[PDB]
Amino acid sequence: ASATRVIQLLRNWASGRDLQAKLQLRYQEISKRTQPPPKLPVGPSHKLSNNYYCTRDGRREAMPPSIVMSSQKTEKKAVTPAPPIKRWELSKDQPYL
Amino acid sequence: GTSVKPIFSRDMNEAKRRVRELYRAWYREVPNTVHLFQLDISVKQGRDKVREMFMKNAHVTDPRVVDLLVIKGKMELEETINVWKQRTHIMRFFHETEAPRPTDFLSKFYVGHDP
Amino acid sequence: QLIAVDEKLDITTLTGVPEEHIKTRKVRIFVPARNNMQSGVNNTKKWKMEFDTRERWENPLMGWSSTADPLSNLVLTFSTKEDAVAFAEKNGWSFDVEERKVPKPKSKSYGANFSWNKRTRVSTK
Amino acid sequence: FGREDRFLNYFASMRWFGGVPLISLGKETVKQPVYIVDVSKGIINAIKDPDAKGKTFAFVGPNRYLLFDLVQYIFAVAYRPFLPYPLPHFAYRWVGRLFEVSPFEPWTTRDKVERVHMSDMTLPHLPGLEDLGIQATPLELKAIEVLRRHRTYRWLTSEMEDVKPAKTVNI
Amino acid sequence: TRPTIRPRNDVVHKQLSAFGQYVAEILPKYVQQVQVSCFNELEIFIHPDGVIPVLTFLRDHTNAQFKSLADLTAVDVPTRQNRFEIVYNLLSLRFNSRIRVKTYTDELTPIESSVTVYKAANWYEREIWDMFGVFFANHPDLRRILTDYGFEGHPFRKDFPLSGYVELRYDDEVKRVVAEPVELAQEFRKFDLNSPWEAFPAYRQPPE
Amino acid sequence: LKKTTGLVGLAVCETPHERLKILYTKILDVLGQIPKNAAYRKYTEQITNEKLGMVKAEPDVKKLEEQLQGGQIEEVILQAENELSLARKMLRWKPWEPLVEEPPANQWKWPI
Amino acid sequence: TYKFVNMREPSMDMKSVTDRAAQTLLWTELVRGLGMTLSYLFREPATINYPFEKGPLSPRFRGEHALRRYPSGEERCIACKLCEAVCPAQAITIEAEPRADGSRRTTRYDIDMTKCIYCGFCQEACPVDAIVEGPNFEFSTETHEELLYNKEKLLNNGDKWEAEIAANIQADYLYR
Amino acid sequence: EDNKQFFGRHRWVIYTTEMNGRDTFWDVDGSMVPPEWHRWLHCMTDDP
Amino acid sequence: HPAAHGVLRLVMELSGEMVRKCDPHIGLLHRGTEKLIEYKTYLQALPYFDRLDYVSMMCNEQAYSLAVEKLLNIQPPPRAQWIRVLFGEITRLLNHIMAVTTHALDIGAMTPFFWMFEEREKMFEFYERVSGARMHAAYIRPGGVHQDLPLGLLDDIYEFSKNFSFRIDELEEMLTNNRIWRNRTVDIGVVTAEDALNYGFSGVMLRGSGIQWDLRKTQPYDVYDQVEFDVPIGSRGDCYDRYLCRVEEMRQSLRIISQCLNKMPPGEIKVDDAKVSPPKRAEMKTSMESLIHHFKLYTEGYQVPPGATYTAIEAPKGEFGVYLVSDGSSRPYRCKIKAPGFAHLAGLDKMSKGHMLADVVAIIGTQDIVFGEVDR
Ligand SMILES: COC1=C(OC)C(=O)C(CC=C(C)C)=C(C)C1=O
Ligand code: SF4
Ligand code: SF4
């Protein structure tokens, strides 16, 4: 910033923080608007051999849903959809604001 | 038997009673609608339009269909009474900007291909 | 309890469709024919319902194609012909039904290509 | 006559002064006003009519009114007090001349005063609206849509069938 | 099979199947089918008369506790005698699980309102009625929610046209907005995209 | 002893053991009127007997909370009240009867 | 893992009680807010001097559409209609026929710009880089009809903006 | 250009007073910038 | 109305300035999105999710992409998922700035809006640099992301993130301890935990009443299990606690953004399956299979196996879900969108009991409602 030092002191005293250290306007620390060209990696299925598509076909491995207890067609412990959720812990970083 | 369940009415007589109650409510409401919406029509025109809307589906013989029609009529009456509706909505019942469509064979032949 | 109606199903007064697009429409209930450019048959398994073709004209600006009937794009899909007939009847539309066309089985013989006395022998491969 | 007309609106404007000056109290003038939508529809139909090539039409309303009764009805529909007083032709003409000097749209002119106090001609030998398929709209069904703007807040919600149509000198 | 294919969790699948068996055992009067999908989602198919008991049991039972109604909607399948499918999506915070409850109805048969069971259902039911025309009995205030005042029809039905039947414009003669039959400068262009060759053999249907 | 359970509208309960015992006894009383072979009765009786037995065996409310795995004993009491209400409703509904009105032939068939 | 936002308890000693009393009676926090506004008053504003200064853009920016040519002047578009097929708004209308020399070329290429959502799908779908979204964004009109582009308008836009479009493409095609 | 200014104010254009046919002493707009200077001015490149 | 937050006809029943009844009328922005989706391919329907909740675009893209990926039984590459979480946290920051500053503007504090919308502008620049569009990028796709990051984007994201905390601090200095702000927000629109659970609330509307729920912690989706953050919890269930929760969520999302910046892995950006994801342009112009797959994916689109899913994410406004039904073709049969604002607004009449006009204005702001997703 181009502010004179007395203005900087006035700003820092009015706000209570050193404003100059973290300016909202970005002066010149940003990336250049022109960059070198990228190379870019190909990916996992680019292998020349041992790459048959039937071994990596996600869509063809989907199947219709499993039918449990179709109506047309002891011990018996009670059950729940999933184990009970476990209590959250209280923020070793900063528990209270 | 056909094993069907009702909405409100068991036969056509209860359905007709509900239709008569809805007609009474709309007939009572028309003058207030003309006053509140500042319509340029008369109360007679509004009541004739209400009667025409009722007669448009006077051929229904299913009590469930009549029940749903009465429910829809009550919904429309609630919209009118609370002023949710605007003047344009009330006046859409009259089709004031639509040119008449002729119904005889010769005029339809003259204008276009539609039957 | 139940009320035991004995009428015919008719929902036309509840669908909000204008009177013109109920009485003057004719829907077609058919299984689409196979596209003759391809050998696949996966598009000839279901029944289709479509409305009669209405007028299209050229837009004075841009020369685009204009339409005035709202049902020009509506196409329904049904598992059987009876379901489509029931839907059309309960909606009040008059319909035409075309029976499904199936390719009849054929007798193929690779050895017939080289027959000793028949006309089936092939001059080239 | 219509929402933007210089007919019904013109009469309504006179209330600010106090009284309504009329030549001969409007008892010797007969008017046959026609609705705007009827005229527009008649023009559209004359475009589409192959028989109306060289024809000459007269577009008039269904009723004929005395000027006094027409202005009384106009003031009744707007719920304004009607104070008609007779003004001689020369006095009215003098008043018209004064208004004319306006560099903007004049409130009235000598020509406007002349045309206002002139009876509408009867030309039964000419074809009319009914020969183009138009049923002319009476003033009693469309006056409220023009004059509701001229009412005070107290009378703004009054309905159309409340103001007792005027007497027409027909036949 | 490793990099590009979504992983499958067997443990979750087993738990959902057991809970589906549990729910089907407890309510045999209404449950017609229980299903668990391969991406770990559990579905329960019920008779329309069991809407209230099943939802209440799933909300209030100690082993269920699905206290939140995530979503309620309808699906229209015109080929079925019962046109409309009603889908409830429930989430359980106590057991960190989700469940889906399904039922069916047609144009003239009402479904019981689930407002007593869930406060959230009041708006969803209104939207189902507006978009599909399904009536819910004993609703506190049933009326249109999304469509314009006086709008006719139910636009989510398959039969309803995409562009509707009417349009709006301002008319200077009547000095208001008027409704007229739809006319389009350019008609929407329908595409036929489906391939004539079958894609997924695992879903092939018997040839009837 | 504890303040502010942490959920808005959920007051702290004093003497929660007595409340839980009362609620579990009432639940068992209601379940006693359901047919013995009904699955709801036996499953609910099993779980509520486990919870009652664990309540009777622990005087410390924190260790009771960590044993019940039910999240903050006040919500355990709320769940017990919910279960009692459900038990009465279930007694009225009788959902242990056989299935009514099997669905149509292809009601649930997808695709189409 | 969770934290509390409003679960603190104030001190009850005489010192802090008098501190809070002085806060109540002398408006200290309000003075602090005034001080923050005063601090902002003396900073440099973030406003730019449009139209003499412009906002920063990137080579990937999607603007007004254009049709491109090969270096010889021949058009790139070959009427494959992939852009028409993929367009989510149905904003592209295309007609074609064999040209007088047998080439596969269009006779109609219209883009309704009041239908377009400017998603850039058409330029991804194009296999010859014929249709692009160019960097221009200042093309407001006074009538609706000026935003219904035909083939001549799009070709003129391409000829007008090619010098920038080619440089923008050179800067991004290695990411595509 | 003035690189001491913050990003957005470090480049600017002073428009001409006469373009193809109109007097632009007062009436200027961003569409008077040709494409090459358009690319430089909007910071899509670093090279003028 | 300035405080109507777009198109809302809130019919209100008042005795003096006291509110007796709130009757929210909606549908003034109902555009019929779901039918339109029924008329498109899965790629063509993606830009609609940008315009559902136009303050959190990439989050909607992520939810829809997760649902389509689940129905496709495929998996995005790790770099795509890290990019998705990074931009989801950036989107959360954008949404929370919008929500807090416009709530303050309704209540009468205009300055923080102007202070924070400059940060919003810089984040729009990040959006445009990655996709070419400031707010409807359409970057996140079912197979991953459309394009890789430009060579200097992470540096500028780091430069923004190392300074955003001071802006949060300035906003907090303006609002948190102001007695007028506390008078206008404390004890306004209190809702109990049980009523919030029953009414279908989600997100901050649950957390402000003490409910310890967050989908990123309980049901993580992309790489949210590999980042660390805290969940702010309120204790009074009023507007002030929800405001504090949103500020702390901005701080936690800054934390997550730092972690995502440090742990960005290399590799491809979309699944290496050309029958779902389009190939690169050079491959399309060089090899036959790539051209065929490009043609078919941009004309017909990929077929999704039949089935139905409900996929939900932790959107900045609450739980955002899609009930997507597939019939086996390239077009969805049905796509029901679940917006949290729908339930939140349906619960407005309950939250307004015993309050005044200004209290109701404040209550609308606290709910964080966008009507694009409410009306759909
Ligand atoms: C983000 O939420 C929104 C608002 O609240 C901030 C609005 O005011 C409005 C409209 C009103 C002003 C003038 C922009 C819209 C459209 C909106 O979406
Ligand atoms: S940018 Fe998108 S909406 Fe616009 S023409 Fe191209 S494909 Fe169509
Ligand atoms: S612009 Fe490109 S995609 Fe569109 S028709 Fe021409 S070549 Fe095909």
Tab-separated table of N, CA and C and ligand atoms in Angstrom, chain I residues 1-2 4-7 54-55 98 102 317 369-371, ligand 1:
chain	number	residue	atom	x	y	z
I	1	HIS	N	-39.990	-6.932	-2.288
I	1	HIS	CA	-39.621	-6.462	-0.968
I	1	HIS	C	-38.130	-6.703	-0.779
I	2	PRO	N	-37.403	-5.731	-0.222
I	2	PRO	CA	-35.959	-5.931	-0.016
I	2	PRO	C	-35.624	-7.122	0.864
I	4	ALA	N	-37.430	-9.921	1.221
I	4	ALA	CA	-38.122	-11.130	0.788
I	4	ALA	C	-37.180	-12.179	0.207
I	5	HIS	N	-35.847	-11.776	0.109
I	5	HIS	CA	-34.836	-12.756	-0.321
I	5	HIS	C	-35.135	-13.389	-1.664
I	6	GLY	N	-35.704	-12.469	-2.663
I	6	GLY	CA	-36.039	-12.897	-4.004
I	6	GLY	C	-37.513	-12.792	-4.324
I	7	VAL	N	-38.158	-13.936	-4.538
I	7	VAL	CA	-39.572	-13.967	-4.892
I	7	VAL	C	-40.346	-14.765	-3.849
I	54	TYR	N	-28.326	-21.122	-6.343
I	54	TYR	CA	-27.342	-20.336	-7.060
I	54	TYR	C	-26.326	-19.642	-6.182
I	55	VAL	N	-26.309	-19.975	-4.930
I	55	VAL	CA	-25.242	-19.505	-4.060
I	55	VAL	C	-24.235	-20.614	-3.772
I	98	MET	N	-22.500	-14.920	1.925
I	98	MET	CA	-23.796	-14.433	1.460
I	98	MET	C	-24.826	-14.435	2.582
I	102	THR	N	-26.100	-10.877	4.234
I	102	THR	CA	-27.448	-10.455	3.872
I	102	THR	C	-28.383	-10.484	5.077
I	317	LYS	N	-26.337	-25.026	3.072
I	317	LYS	CA	-27.626	-24.648	3.633
I	317	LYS	C	-28.321	-25.790	4.362
I	369	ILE	N	-32.474	-19.138	3.246
I	369	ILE	CA	-33.270	-19.618	2.116
I	369	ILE	C	-33.033	-18.982	0.731
I	370	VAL	N	-32.839	-19.834	-0.276
I	370	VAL	CA	-32.698	-19.429	-1.675
I	370	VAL	C	-33.913	-20.082	-2.324
I	371	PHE	N	-34.691	-19.326	-3.090
I	371	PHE	CA	-35.936	-19.854	-3.632
I	371	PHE	C	-35.762	-20.625	-4.930
J	1	LIG	C1	-29.463	-15.003	-2.283
J	1	LIG	O1	-30.770	-14.729	-1.862
J	1	LIG	C2	-31.396	-13.686	-2.554
J	1	LIG	C3	-31.629	-12.529	-1.980
J	1	LIG	O2	-31.248	-12.324	-0.654
J	1	LIG	C4	-29.912	-11.958	-0.514
J	1	LIG	C5	-32.309	-11.404	-2.750
J	1	LIG	O3	-32.493	-10.387	-2.185
J	1	LIG	C6	-32.735	-11.614	-4.205
J	1	LIG	C7	-33.422	-10.548	-5.071
J	1	LIG	C8	-33.515	-9.135	-4.500
J	1	LIG	C9	-32.278	-8.255	-4.668
J	1	LIG	C10	-32.588	-6.860	-5.185
J	1	LIG	C11	-31.107	-8.901	-5.393
J	1	LIG	C12	-32.496	-12.782	-4.767
J	1	LIG	C13	-32.900	-13.051	-6.207
J	1	LIG	C14	-31.814	-13.898	-3.994
J	1	LIG	O4	-31.614	-14.935	-4.523
